[PDB]
From a paper:
ATP-sensitive potassium channels ([name]) are metabolic sensors that convert the intracellular ATP/ADP ratio to the excitability of cells. Functional [name] channels are hetero-octamers composed of four Kir6 and four SUR subunits. Kir6 are inward rectifier potassium channels that require PI(4,5)P2 for maximum activity. The SUR subunits bind to activating Mg-ADP and drugs, including insulin secretagogues and [name] openers.
Based on these observations, we made [name] mutation on the [name]-Kir6.2 fusion constructs, in which the C terminus of [name] is covalently linked to the N terminus of Kir6.2 by a long linker to ensure the correct 4:4 stoichiometry between Kir6.2 and SUR126, yielding the H175Kcryo-EM construct. Subsequent refinement resolved two 3D classes: one class has a closed and the other has a widened inner helix gate. In contrast, in the structure with widened gate, the inner part of the M2 helix moves outward. Particularly, the side chains of L164 and F168 move away from the center, resulting in the dilation of the pore. The radius of the ion permeation pathway at the bundle crossing of TMD now increases to 3 Å. However, the constriction at the cytosolic G-loop gate still shows a radius of 2.6 Å. While in the pre-open state, the side chains of F60 swing away, which allows the expansion of M2. In contrast, there is no ADP density in the pre-open state, and we observed an obvious structural reorganization around the nucleotide-binding pocket of Kir6.2. During channel opening, there is a 6° anti-clockwise rotation of CTD viewing from the intracellular side, resulting in the clash between E51 and the nucleotide-binding pocket in the pre-open state. Although the ion permeation pathway of the pre-open state does not allow the permeation of fully hydrated potassium ions, the hallmarks of [name] channel activation, such as the enlargement of inner helix gate of Kir6.2, the dissociation of inhibitory nucleotide from Kir6.2, the rotation of Kir6.2 CTD, and the binding of activator NN414 and activatory Mg-nucleotides on NBD-dimerized [name], all suggest the current pre-open structure represents the “activated” state of [name].
Author numbering:
A (entry chain A), B (entry chain C): 32 to 356
C (entry chain B): 1139 to 1286
D (entry chain B): 2 to 275, 281 to 329, 337 to 621
Write the structure that this text describes.
Amino acid sequence: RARFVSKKGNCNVAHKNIREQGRFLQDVFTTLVDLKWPHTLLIFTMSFLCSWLLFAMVWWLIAFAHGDLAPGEGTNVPCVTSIHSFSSAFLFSIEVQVTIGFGGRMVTEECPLAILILIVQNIVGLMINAIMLGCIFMKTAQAKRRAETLIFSKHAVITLRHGRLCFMLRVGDLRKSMIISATIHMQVVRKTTSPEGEVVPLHQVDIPMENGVGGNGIFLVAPLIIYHVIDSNSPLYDLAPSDLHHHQDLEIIVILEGVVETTGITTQARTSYLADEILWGQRFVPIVAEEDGRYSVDYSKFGNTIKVPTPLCTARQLDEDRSLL
Amino acid sequence: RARFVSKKGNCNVAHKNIREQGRFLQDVFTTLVDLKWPHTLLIFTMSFLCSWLLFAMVWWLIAFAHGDLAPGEGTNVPCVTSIHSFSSAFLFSIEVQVTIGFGGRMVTEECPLAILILIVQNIVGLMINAIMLGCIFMKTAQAKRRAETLIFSKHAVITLRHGRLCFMLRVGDLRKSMIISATIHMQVVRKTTSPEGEVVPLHQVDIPMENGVGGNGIFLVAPLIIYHVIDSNSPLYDLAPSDLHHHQDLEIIVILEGVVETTGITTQARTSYLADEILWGQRFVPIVAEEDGRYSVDYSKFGNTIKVPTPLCTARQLDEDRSLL
Amino acid sequence: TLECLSRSTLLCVSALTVISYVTPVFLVALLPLAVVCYFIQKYFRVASRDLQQLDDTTQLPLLSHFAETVEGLTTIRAFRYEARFQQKLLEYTDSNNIASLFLTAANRWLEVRMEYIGACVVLIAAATSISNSLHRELSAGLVGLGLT
Amino acid sequence: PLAFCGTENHSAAYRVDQGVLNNGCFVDALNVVPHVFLLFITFPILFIGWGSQSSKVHIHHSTWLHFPGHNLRWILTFILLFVLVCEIAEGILSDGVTESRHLHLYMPAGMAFMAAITSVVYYHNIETSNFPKLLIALLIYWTLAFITKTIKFVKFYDHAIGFSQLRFCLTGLLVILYGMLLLVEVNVIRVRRYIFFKTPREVKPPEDLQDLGVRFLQPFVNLLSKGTYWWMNAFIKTAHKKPIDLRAIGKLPIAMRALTNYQRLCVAFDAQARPQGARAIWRALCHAFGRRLILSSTFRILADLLGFAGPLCIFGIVDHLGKKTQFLGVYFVSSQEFLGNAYVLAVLLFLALLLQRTFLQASYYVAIETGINLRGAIQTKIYNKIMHLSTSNLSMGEMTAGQICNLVAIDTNQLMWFFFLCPNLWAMPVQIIVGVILLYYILGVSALIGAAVIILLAPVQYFVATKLSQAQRSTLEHSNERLKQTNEMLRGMKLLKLYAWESIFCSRVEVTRRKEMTSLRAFAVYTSISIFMNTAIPIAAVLITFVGHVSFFKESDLSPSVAFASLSLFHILVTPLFLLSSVVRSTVKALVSVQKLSEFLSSAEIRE
Ligand SMILES: CC1(NC2=NS(=O)(=O)c3sc(Cl)cc3N2)CC1
């Protein structure tokens, strides 16, 4: 069966039959940033190279119009000195736009059109420099790479905490640096049908994380076990261990939304769990222990679970057995 | 009748009789960024061109005061070499400020005022470079263009889900890239009058989105149907299908507030629905289907709805009929 | 078809032998075109075999719809079912016609590819023969043989 | 080295002392300018709009509409590409005389060729995305191109180049094509006011392409994909991965539906009446479908005219293998020197062959589509006659249900294949006339003798054709009776086995088949006579020409160019005569089919 979100956070949904193209034409900057790294390197090279070539052709045409390309006669002030071919105009355009200025090839005061083209080339070069350097720095400072160092346990767990049959997870951070105002958004994706007859193919019903204040905020120095208490309001209220095989409609996705402390740009880390990746009657082992003078986190035991005696009844049947007693 | 928010998100409210002008004089940067693209291009050209012209006039006046413009006599060290006219001073000011430095025209050590003007021109050029390049990059990296790729269904819908007569929508994203911590804020704008006699012409009463946790957060990989359950606390509790014509006071606006994953700048997408654009007894068709190895979203059916048997009573009358039975 | 096939498949091999005699280097360029042709016959023959079969399996409910209409004409006109059966004919005719149209356009696809390969044969043979006659003498008469 | 104008007379071509526009190198660089402008505008717009697609997000326009002058713009772009290829060839030929390489002769034309390809890609992406406001850049480019080329032409007029030089004619043709494309852009602005001038007009896409779920995109694709059948490619791919069924094949377009062609045929028959018979059926088919038949005949006529570009190119190439003006400081090549050449004729032959094959396949497709629409209309009319038929026609032996079903399974197919073969017969005499004229132009009076040898066996050809028509009429007459007897034997096989009468009815079917085989033997004897006559006419004609060209006449030498060009012309002219038996068989089967269709449609009915 298809997977809505990969375990590395990749979203497998394909967008097709998009009739509206002018939305992408109005949004050029987002198309430019979201390109792949070879494509952005190609555009970054080609924009500067095309600007140099275009103004080089303008300089070469100006030097042709003034007779500077003709070696006949002499003692005539050229528009730009030492322009003899297209290579001279290309080197001079590179010297102007990158503001190197060797000065063997230099604008003169004889031609006002040379001064106007110099002004236009400087303005266009400043604009291209600003846009391209900002695009490259925004691509390097993207917060998708920070979500790689955020890890999730490979197997979700269902056990009994305070007699409530909670659905537990484990998040973890591989970085010394913190994540500012970290929030956790857990959803259950299925193909739920309303009693009237409406079929939603990827119905996402969010499940509350037991924070303690009724919020989403977490503190992520150490790995945390994130547990959603399965109660009467939970979508997993009828979930059974007779379920949780590979050919089951259930999917549960966890989203860690935070702000990177070092860059200030918000990041999003995603990890989904299929039904066969949710273990019944198992519990995460403790991995944090007191070191020589501090706390040490054993990341080799990050996904490790143990068998724990847990009832095989659903939360409905467990609640009914509790009410009968 | 007038529209408070356009279907593309444009807010039609006109601000008039603003006596306070000094707020705009204190806030220069926001006036500069929020200009139109030809106006920002004009200011970006004119600031650099005026700086070059002003320091060019200063250099020309200095070379005049030193007698460098006079071709009479010789073997006298000028303040700047090869300054013969206003064009020479303009080219030299361009060489100094853009830091090209051809060096045919070069500052000398004879005049201390030339050194002082060089220092002042370099400092002013660095300031103008920083402010102007940052303004142009902040204008290019604006998050208004990302809201163009966020789409909303053209027709809002009212149907029956779990017997509660919900007001449904459809949001959608045309981008592969995600939106970080996306929130949905739905409001109802009318001309509600208090029982004491206070008339509010554009009274905005927000309506809750049925998230599942009592929050606003959504996950926007696939298009979602956003439904507000019309209950006793809803402003639409007395809403009828005998309403929902063009000459009706009702307006419902949906705001999608998010963070662009690729730039980190928060974006806002708006779409309002008039009364005639809310369809009674209709339901959005499923558009997401399992592809060859993943999920495919048919955006050609994005706004498509079908007729569904729905009661023509209001939520008050439906609740009274439920209480009678 | 046998007479047409014999004439075509023997004029082709005769012409390729003639161009190979006057310009042996054409044999070097005879190999990739025979590759390209092969790939075209790889892609067309799977599609056409479907489009022929779909053209035949849409012809059977059309023709049989006539056969039951003529023998059951009194029964169809007694139930006043003339319009319904004419609509059934419209459905069957549209199915058969669009199956035949896709078969036709697949044939035109193949023939456009093959005729462009033939134009490439003329261009390659002309280039080799002209370059020879300007470099290594072909008596200016074998060139006309190869081009013809 | 690699200078834009060659370093001759100490780079005297770079002097602008006489005038800036009076220098050919500067005017060539000014012609370079708009192509660079178009590339540098179009490439970022195309890369952002259509190169930003990813594997996760695919953008597909399922529906599109065509701009006004679409066919004209594609034709003008193809002619522009052809003339720019000729300009590249002329510049290379002119530069080969000089010792140094003058880059201004061919690099502007190559840049123009790249710009024309880029402009047609930009136009197609705009048209399939429906963004008319992005046409402005194209408009600017055409304006710039026209202006620069006009300047070149005016300067060529000022130095008195004249029409003897090919570059002057190519410059004038380029000016004409750029002006026509500018007028096409102005027409697009006028019909669709996308620019800031009043309210723009939305054409809206056609409904069959909009939401009918049709997948036969041939009426809705551009001329390059209409002629090369490019849209079929995906189907040819998907047939590897999944078998083609009646879901992968969509629904018929509205113009190709059976009801539309049936109503058109009914309008034709009503226009005739304001009944039946073979002649009125033929005129009704003419009124309903002859416009499409004329379109296919026009494509076949153009293909026949471009088929003669083969023998003429062979004449020129072999004539050159058997074997000037300095102007504004750069050697010019005349039209006789350009068309003389050898490789230039090979390139022109290759382009003419590509255009001829595209036109011929378009002719075949239009003829077959017309035949399929005719088959749908005729089947609908036959069924509507059946619903209005009387059972007394079948009850008194006037017609049988096998014959009524064979009116669809057999007779409609014969009429359809004759409608396939009609444009070739319509366009054959023009090809014959032009071929005989070109044979006289290459050979002379010897070609008149060879054409007389071909003409002297035309009464024998007509006699054989009449005998073939009579034999095929007898064959159809006996085959219908044989199929009727075979059907009545197969349906009543149990009674024939029980009464042991299987051999008697088998013998009766054998007698009818023996009469059919006698008619088929007469047809095959006269077919063999026709094939021998149409294969010995070229041999005797070629022999009598090439003997009379040297032994009888002494007007010119034989030469390989004249002989092989005339050999190609003779083969091209006698290729349609090879299929005379198949043509006369299809024609007489159509005549029989139309006659019995008229007999069926003029039969008895049920009174109201
Ligand atoms: C197939 C080709 N050669 C050819 N065609 S032909 O017109 O039938 C004829 S007749 C005669 Cl005698 C000698 C020939 N040689 C290459 C055109």
